[PDB]
Design a protein around this ligand. Sequence first.
Ligand SMILES: *[C@@H]1O[C@H](CO)[C@@H](O)[C@H](O)[C@H]1NC(C)=O
Ligand SMILES: *[C@@H]1O[C@H](CO)[C@@H](O)[C@H](O)[C@H]1NC(C)=O
Ligand SMILES: *[C@@H]1O[C@H](CO)[C@@H](O)[C@H](O)[C@H]1NC(C)=O
Ligand SMILES: *[C@@H]1O[C@H](CO)[C@@H](O)[C@H](O)[C@H]1NC(C)=O
Ligand SMILES: *[C@@H]1O[C@H](CO)[C@@H](O)[C@H](O)[C@H]1NC(C)=O
Lengths: 326, 326, 326, 326, 326
Amino acid sequence: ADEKRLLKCILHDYDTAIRPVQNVSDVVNVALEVTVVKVIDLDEKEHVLTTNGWIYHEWNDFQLKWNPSDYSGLKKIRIPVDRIWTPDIVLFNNADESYRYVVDKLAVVYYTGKVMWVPHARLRSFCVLDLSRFPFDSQMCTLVFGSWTHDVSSVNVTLRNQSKVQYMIDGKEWQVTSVQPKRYQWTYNSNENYAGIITGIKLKRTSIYYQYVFIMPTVLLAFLTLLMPFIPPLGKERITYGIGLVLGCTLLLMMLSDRMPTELGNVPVVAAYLAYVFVMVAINLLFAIMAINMSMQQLTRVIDRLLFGSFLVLTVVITISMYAHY
Amino acid sequence: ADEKRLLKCILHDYDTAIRPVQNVSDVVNVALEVTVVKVIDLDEKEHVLTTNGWIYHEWNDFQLKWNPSDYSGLKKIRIPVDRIWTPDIVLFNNADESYRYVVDKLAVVYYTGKVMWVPHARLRSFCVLDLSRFPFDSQMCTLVFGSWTHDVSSVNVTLRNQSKVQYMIDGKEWQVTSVQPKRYQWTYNSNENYAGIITGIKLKRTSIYYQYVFIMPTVLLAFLTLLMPFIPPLGKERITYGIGLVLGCTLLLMMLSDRMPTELGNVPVVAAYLAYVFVMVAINLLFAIMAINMSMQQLTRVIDRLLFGSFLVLTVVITISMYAHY
Amino acid sequence: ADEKRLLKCILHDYDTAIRPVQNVSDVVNVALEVTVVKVIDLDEKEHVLTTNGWIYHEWNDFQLKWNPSDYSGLKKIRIPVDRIWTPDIVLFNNADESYRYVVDKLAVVYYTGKVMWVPHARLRSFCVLDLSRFPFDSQMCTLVFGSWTHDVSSVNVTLRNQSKVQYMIDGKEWQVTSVQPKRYQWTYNSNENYAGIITGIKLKRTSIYYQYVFIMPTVLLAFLTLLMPFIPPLGKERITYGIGLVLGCTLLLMMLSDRMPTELGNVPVVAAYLAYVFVMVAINLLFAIMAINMSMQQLTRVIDRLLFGSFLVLTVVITISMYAHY
Amino acid sequence: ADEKRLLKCILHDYDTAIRPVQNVSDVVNVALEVTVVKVIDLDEKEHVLTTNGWIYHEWNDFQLKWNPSDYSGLKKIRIPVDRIWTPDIVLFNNADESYRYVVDKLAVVYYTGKVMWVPHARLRSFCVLDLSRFPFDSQMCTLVFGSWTHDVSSVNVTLRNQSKVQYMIDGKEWQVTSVQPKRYQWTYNSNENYAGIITGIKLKRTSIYYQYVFIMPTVLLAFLTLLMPFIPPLGKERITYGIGLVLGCTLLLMMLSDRMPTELGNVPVVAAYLAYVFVMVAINLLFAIMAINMSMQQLTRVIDRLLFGSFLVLTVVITISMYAHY
Amino acid sequence: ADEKRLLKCILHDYDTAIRPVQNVSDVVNVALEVTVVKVIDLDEKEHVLTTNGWIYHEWNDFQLKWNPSDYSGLKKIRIPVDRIWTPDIVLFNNADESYRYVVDKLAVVYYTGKVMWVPHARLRSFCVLDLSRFPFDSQMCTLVFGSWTHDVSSVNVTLRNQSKVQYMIDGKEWQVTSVQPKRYQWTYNSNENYAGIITGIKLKRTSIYYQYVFIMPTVLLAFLTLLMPFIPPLGKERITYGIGLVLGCTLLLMMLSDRMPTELGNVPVVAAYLAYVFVMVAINLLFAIMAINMSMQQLTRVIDRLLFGSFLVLTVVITISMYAHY
Ligand SMILES: *[C@@H]1O[C@H](CO)[C@@H](O)[C@H](O)[C@H]1NC(C)=O
Ligand SMILES: *[C@@H]1O[C@H](CO)[C@@H](O)[C@H](O)[C@H]1NC(C)=O
Ligand SMILES: *[C@@H]1O[C@H](CO)[C@@H](O)[C@H](O)[C@H]1NC(C)=O
Ligand SMILES: *[C@@H]1O[C@H](CO)[C@@H](O)[C@H](O)[C@H]1NC(C)=O
Ligand SMILES: *[C@@H]1O[C@H](CO)[C@@H](O)[C@H](O)[C@H]1NC(C)=O
């Protein structure tokens, strides 16, 4: 067949390690575009972002050159990348042992020498996230692609400006929206430059899981702690009520500590609210113990009334602040 | 032997990367049928479906052509796929790093050129599931198979209509039933088309695990919360009973939050019932605290009677609604 | 040396994909015997059985044939399986991504053409288990070995009847005993037959872990629930005692739900006993609340006496039934 | 260079599968010595021992033979094992899917034909452990190395008696000391013998983790249970104290069951002590309920005094026995 | 092209296993420098340090030698390491099964024969850590690189003194600072020396996670235990308050035991503080039980006053000591 003829012709002496430049003072312009098809997860316990998508490679191999008229058309031809040269472009913030692709067995080569690859992949990428508004947090995770072997004088990583589009994924957790990728240049020993593309995706947590698990038991334990100082001290049920709030808030703290990551810069607002509720139970237990201590003078109810007034107004302020965060 | 003769004959110049078409404007029709032998698990915590089954490949390789009379019969012959051409057909929603097969070492080739492969595999597939009726939920998970390298003008993925059958698996968790697969066409840059088969399987959770773990302690804590307002307030055991319900419902919430996934769109009905029980304990604690607060006028029992009446009728309505869900 | 001479002689034109039959209407009889050396674990949470053992292959390769007198003896010779033909026999219920062996680098070939392989392996096998008597359960897990590529007309999987022996392993968990393997024939599209061996091993759980973790706290919480109705109602300690049983039985339920698998057909007897204890605490709390409700007529002790009598006789019946299970 | 000359000379016709014997009735003596550099962990939950060390191979390859005077010295030469013959010696109790080495890329070959390998490795080995003295337990785990392909008539596994040394590792968990390795011979079908070395290492748990987590809360809950019968029954705080001990001992039991393995032969002494404390709380709750039951004759304090006396003397006996275990 | 000419010239007879020395009594000086770009995690539960960085190899290959004037410049050339010799330098304390690189597909070779490699990698390294000041602990973890095959007489591992720089990473967990690497020489059978570089990095935990999870509930439970002896004994709420502290401190202990590793040498200060709080609750429960025991002479308040005085002054001493640790 004619498809075997050009394949045996233009791969008769091809070496997969030779950089395809006609002159020694020349580079190859490798065009990249990462496109996410599905954001799988954002594991903040280990600061990784698991995602699925395809990275569009496009370079210009001048050694694979022919005219279609000698082969009766056939502009497109498909070669595995194990027999042609490929640029070593990997993630700059890879979060696993080795970088592997889902499909990497074919690459489209045109008659003009330009080569497309498009290997689909599952990318685990490190991305910095600040949990100062957990779980009502808007995020931004970056994927950095580039060459760690070839410098700028060997290859040139270029974004494609012909498709300056933006896309969105309406996940049930994250309302993922994309940011226009840019090029940022990393140096090496202040002489050699190692270029690379950077692509941000702006995650936005729209969750009903973390609200139901963390927001509503914390505000209801706050409600019970506010209901506590109407209990009269001379029956001996206020102290066991307070220690029940202590145990329930300890269980809620253990929930939160199981879910909140170790890799933490600032305290989340749900954690600060839970700490506020926990120390509020502590202060109310102090007031109950003092009240029953001098109950053995009996004009205690105005102290509990002003304590409920202060805790009511400050709890309304704190809850309104957390609602303004949401 | 004669089996070596045709193998050395029709693989004397075979290239595994050449697409087997006689004309350049021709495609190869690859027939697919996925068949599940056992659905292993549906991990909704990570939205994956682990299953075991074999995917039936069938294409037409015109380069492997011979007559049996020159080889004294032998219509069937078995070649490993590492020496012949195979289509790059993978899952469109694969949920692991790389796509691998359990057995992929043989493929049946006939004298008419048609090639069967049948590689058995363990497929981890992403599938969307809405837990609005957890755990009495009927589901539907899809397996999408297709080529991410060859377009429609190179290969053509075709369902086989000769076997339009349906099957079922009677698992102890899922009553798995199958749906007639169809073909859905995915586009690429609005010019190149990338076809593929889609196969739905309709899962149905028939579980006694999640009922015993979640349904019966929630309804029994509801029963205890309904029994609560018959306790007289002037003994100081109602408040510790209410905080015991608070701690028990917190433990049940921690059970549920351990089992309910983060990847959540809507709240499950067991979660809504547990939240209703938890806020019912909150309202009953408010009423008990108010009652013992003005116990220091003594006609409290009619308020507790009407409160039990309202909680009884609304609890019967909610439990009847959850039973109508089941 | 003479060992290289026959190796270069009878592998001078050997193809590893040719099925070794002299006539086209002939099969090769591959003799199998799986032998377990150690049953590692039975993970019922994922329905897998991890085991270690060697599978004894034995077939008849007529292409490796020589007389010892031309090579001065040397009946035994050892060839890696990468250079000779091997049958593609795998597990029919494999529970991992790919089937791999611990040692697969040598195979013994005799002068009569018969070939032994014996690759040792760690097998993860799916096996159906019914937990209707957890944890006093006698089990049976099956290992099915066969070819998914070669049919009956290509290879023939045969058990060896020369060694019809039975063995046993005295593990600290499982008293593992073996069952005589048999041959069961699986069909494919009702025309092609795909044979295979099946080997059952009869596990028997002899555990002191699950007894100490689950049986004794459940029966002691039953003992405390039986001790509950001797508490007089007019002190207000019966209700907090009952809610303490509620919280303790909730903790025990959370233990059991952590250990009991999701993949569940029937409720275990320890789970049914725990549910019975939990609803017994519910009924006793109902009786205590009713008693203290009409304590505000004072002839309550006969009701508690008959309640203890009914709960005593039915608890003795249930505990005797669970002991008869053991 | 001269280093390439002998490498091309004595590997000009080398086959990596030929067993290096001049006569057919000859074996090769492969000398083994495993040396542990660091014991990583002993996971008793899965009965594995993770360790790091190098296994010293030494055999006599008569096919790699030369005199140094033809190559101007160069007695030592270094060949990768992929081009020379190596014996297939693996662990007899391997605890992973496949046996792999950390470094296996070089092997030292001398001019006398003797070959050293020394591949460093991370070994996961099954070893039997009896937890009858957890966590004050002295242990012994074995590493068994041998060939599962070559029998005694092919290779001969030999310990080296020139280095009959013993070593020790002072870990913060295990005071690891080594035992002089010996040779134990395993049979196969009572005709073929499969030899192998066995090496015991005597672990000794010197832990402050398991003491602080398990020993001190159990003995302090025992202390509280002993303090319980001084509470007078006519205040209704003894029953809630006893149910608080029930809940605390249930939490401690859940700690222990999380840490104690399923793979259990005998109950640990900490588990037996916790069960004794738990049933002691049960007996004390029975005595408190009886006392408050006939409190409605008032000479109860001598019964509580003799109960404290019996529980004191038997608790001192049990604690002295557990201290004598330590 | 000219780039293929020298590649075919100086690799026309290259063997990848020959050590590149002109004389037999010569070594190759391999220059190493590990550089960390991001410290991923320090898992003290398994004593591993996961990090990302590149290790700078530099050796002198005299077999790859040419002048640029015969090839019109081209001093730099890039060869994959699979076709040239590379030194077998691995981690001496590797914490996984096999040592693999992220990128290892290129290596820069100059016209003077010196070869750079720079493979980026994710290193899991064992490092000793003493948790005597958890979580306010300054740490030091070491990465040891060297050859386990080539001795000092074959290769020579050398640090590069031209870049004696120090760097820092401002993580949200660890304020990572680097230490000047040195060379330490390991012996083998007291005759052969096996050199290697060692590089320390000085970690410093600056966390708000472990403080909020462990420090504040322990000090607040200490605060509640200090508030306990103002409760009058003749109401029967002191004992249930003390058992509530017992249950809350048990939950906090279970938090800490879940987070504190088994691999423990000394008790952490948070663990010692929690044990002190737990035994303080025990002593206060003893004093409350004694007080209510002889309440049935009534001058008890001075004993509780001196007990609060002693517990106040010793708690201030302990908390000031833990603050001086911080
Ligand atoms: C790489 O391509 C960009 C595209 O604009 C260009 O600006 C840059 O100079 C190029 N780098 C080179 C030629 O080294
Ligand atoms: C692929 O096969 C289907 C089968 O009906 C056909 O409808 C479709 O036109 C084919 N696609 C081509 C030929 O591009
Ligand atoms: C396979 O071997 C068994 C052994 O008895 C025999 O019964 C069966 O007929 C054989 N199958 C064939 C020859 O297809
Ligand atoms: C293997 O070596 C040991 C070393 O003493 C020897 O006793 C034994 O007989 C040898 N086995 C043979 C030669 O089969
Ligand atoms: C290795 O290099 C160091 C660098 O100073 C040198 O001191 C040492 O002697 C060398 N080792 C040899 C030549 O064996």
